[PDB]
């Protein structure tokens, strides 16, 4: 009864809508960017936090928008403000961009399935 592993299946690269309900607590993830504004990316999702409990965001996602506010060209500081001030219901449009993300983290690369690997 040979198993069927998720881990080979390609990670979808189209934009997705994620709605997180977090009341008045943190969203539970970290973003990375530059003050240049070349994309804002998720670097880390906290185990058990609202973003984790959504189950639909991952390290390497680019945050395209929050509550209709375009963040494709945001600074990290101003993106954080937007997220922290987004209210109890947070509607994120995200898009998986592991190649771009992998430039941030040491000894990281993307494998054949699109997964981020760190050596």
């Amino acid at each position: 009864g040979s198993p069927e592993f998720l881990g080979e299946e390609d990670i979808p690269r189209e934009p997705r809508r994620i709605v997180i309900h977090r009341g008045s607590t943190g969203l539970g993830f970290n973003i990375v960017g530059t003050e240049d504004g070349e994309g804002i990316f998720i670097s880390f999702i906290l185990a058990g936090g609202p973003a984790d409990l959504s189950g639909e965001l991952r390290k390497g996602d680019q945050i395209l928008s929050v509550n209709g506010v375009d963040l494709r060209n945001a600074s990290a500081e101003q993106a954080a403000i937007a997220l922290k001030n987004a209210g109890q219901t947070v509607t994120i449009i995200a898009q998986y961009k592991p190649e771009e993300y992998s430039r941030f983290e040491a000894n990281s690369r993307v494998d054949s399935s699109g997964r981020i690997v760190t050596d």
């Binding site: 943190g26 969203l27 973003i31 990375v32 530059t34 670097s43 600074s75 500081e77 941030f104």
Partner: peptide, 8 residues
């Protein structure tokens, strides 16, 4: 580095 990381 240009780079900035923050928790939200």
């Amino acid at each position: 580095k240009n780079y900035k990381q923050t928790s939200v």
